[PDB]
């Protein structure tokens, strides 16, 4: 009640260490153990909360690994002080994890902080708790109890950060670290719940990663398929391996077509490339109304011709906007090459035939929807206008864009890769990619509950929730439980047993 909690802890440490040698020289061994028992009651006995809540969490936040190990000793010797240690420090885990994801204004940085708290608690176990396992039990319990509460802020932020770690830079060439931080991804986000939204978003992420730019490594994606195969269903990693098999099918079609133009001897500059896919293992894509230069339409018909062979049973529903393409660009003061997107490639295709178009037939002769075309003009316009030049300036954009293509263009590099768009995405794009999972759980829980009542006739709702939580990779809301109860009654697999929702039957 005079010194600080760490000061009193060091005093207790040294004063207990005093009482040994008193016996060692002169006092009695058989009263050494009564002496330490009494003294430890006098110092540490009956003070296992006012030392062990604040002065625990205070010196954990200060993270003095010496005194944390000191109190670990000083409360692993004592009568039961490690129980107070486990409870106070585990509540400390829950709250000091909870100081991340419940913050809706602070979603720009969540994943790195989660990694940080994971790292800190791991280090406090491995030295400050000296690889005891009770602490690990409280850790995992506390983490899962925490993240059952917010499922679909983290898994989406986590998916974006997983994709961010799946980028090809010049800074990283040791994928061993990215293997190790990938191991931390798997282990740490096994605490994070709602993995179906992460799963579908990772379909979106491999789409946005292959379709523009290039991935961090081949073995990185292979290791992720093998790792995410674990901890989820074995029919939950059928689509991803289907992605890479469909990519190999498209490459084999590429080899076949290149061999079939080996005797036609292409020397022309105009290229067509379609990597074709099936809708069972990929993100779904529906064509949107867009306008294509008629030679591209000729290439579409060529694509039909080479499409109709090789496992016929095939019928066109083409996409002609989702790729990125390399293009040479005429300007004054040099001819450099652009790596750009099809939304912008059509823009640049019209800025060959003339300079002087306006947003009316830029809206029309592209055909591009408003949501895509605004963000198309947020790249290389709404700033840095030396290729396209848009009459509204700044973040605010009005419907009056007047364009005259610029002769002037300056940069110090070749292969001018100015392409945010397809390695970016919009808010309602994310929201819609979430709703394609929201009322997609419907058939999942439908199948699960029809199988349950086909297995056990009576099951209260507080047990249906637990069987579903056992079975599924995401947490099911109480609203969705009412939703499936009512729809099962609509399709005659439930009857309310005893005229209340307490129990049910499988009678129609």
């Amino acid at each position: 009640q005079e010194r600080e909690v760490p000061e009193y802890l060091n005093h207790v440490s040294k004063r207990l260490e005093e009482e040994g040698d008193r016996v060692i020289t002169y006092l009695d061994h058989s009263t050494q153990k009564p002496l330490i028992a009494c003294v430890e009651k006098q110092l540490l006995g009956e003070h296992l909360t006012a030392i062990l809540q604040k002065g625990l969490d205070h010196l954990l936040d200060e993270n003095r690994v010496p005194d944390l190990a000191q109190m670990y000793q000083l409360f692993s010797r004592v009568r039961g002080g490690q129980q107070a240690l486990l409870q106070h420090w585990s509540e400390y885990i829950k709250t000091f994890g909870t100081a991340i994801v419940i913050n809706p204004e602070k979603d720009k940085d969540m994943v790195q902080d989660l990694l940080d708290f994971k790292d800190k608690v791991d280090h406090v176990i491995e030295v400050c708790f000296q690889k005891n396992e009770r602490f690990v039990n409280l850790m995992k319990e506390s983490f899962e109890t925490f993240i059952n509460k917010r499922p679909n802020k983290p898994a989406e932020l986590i998916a974006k950060h997983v994709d961010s770690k799946l980028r090809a830079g010049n800074k990283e060439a040791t994928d061993e670290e990215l293997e190790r931080t990938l191991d931390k991804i798997m282990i740490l986000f096994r605490f994070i719940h709602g993995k179906d939204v992460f799963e579908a978003f990772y379909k979106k992420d491999l789409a946005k990663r292959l379709l523009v730019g290039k991935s961090a490594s081949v073995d990185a994606e292979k290791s992720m398929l093998s790792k995410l195969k674990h901890e989820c269903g074995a029919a939950f990693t059928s689509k991803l391996e289907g992605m890479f098999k469909d990519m190999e099918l498209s490459k084999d079609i590429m080899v076949h077509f290149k061999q079939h133009m080996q005797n036609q001897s292409d020397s022309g500059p105009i290229d067509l490339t379609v990597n074709i896919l099936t809708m069972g293992y990929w993100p779904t894509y529906t064509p949107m109304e867009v306008h294509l230069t008629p030679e591209m339409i000729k290439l579409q018909e060529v694509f039909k011709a080479f499409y109709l062979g090789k496992h016929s049973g095939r019928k066109l529903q083409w996409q002609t906007t989702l790729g990125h393409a390399v293009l040479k660009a005429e300007f004054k003061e040099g001819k450099k090459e652009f790596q750009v997107s099809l939304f912008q490639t059509l823009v640049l295709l019209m800025f060959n035939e003339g300079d002087g178009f306006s947003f009316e037939e830029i809206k029309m002769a592209t055909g591009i929807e408003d949501s895509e075309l605004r963000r198309t003009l947020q790249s290389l316009a709404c700033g840095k206008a030396r290729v396209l030049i848009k009459s509204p300036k700044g973040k605010e954009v009005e419907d009056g864009d007047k364009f005259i293509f610029n002769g002037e263009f300056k940069h110090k590099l070749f292969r001018i890769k100015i392409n945010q768009i397809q390695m970016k995405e919009t808010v309602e794009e994310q929201v819609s990619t979430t709703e394609r999972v929201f009322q997609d759980r419907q058939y999942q829980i439908d199948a699960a509950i029809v199988r349950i009542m086909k297995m056990r006739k009576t099951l209260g709702h507080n047990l249906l929730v637990s069987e579903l939580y056992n079975q599924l990779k995401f947490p099911v809301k109480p609203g969705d439980l009412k939703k499936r109860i009512e729809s099962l009654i609509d399709r005659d697999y439930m009857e309310r047993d005893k005229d209340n929702p307490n129990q049910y039957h499988y009678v129609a």
């Binding site: 292959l210 379709l211 500059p269 809708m279 779904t284 529903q317 002609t320 989702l322 790729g323 640049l348």
Partner: peptide, 21 residues
């Protein structure tokens, strides 16, 4: 020949079903 001379068009797309449900 043009203000962008066409060197590469590349696309990703889906091959679709053709059997009755």
């Amino acid at each position: 020949k043009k203000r962008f001379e066409v060197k590469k068009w590349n696309a990703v797309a889906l091959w679709a079903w053709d059997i009755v449900v």
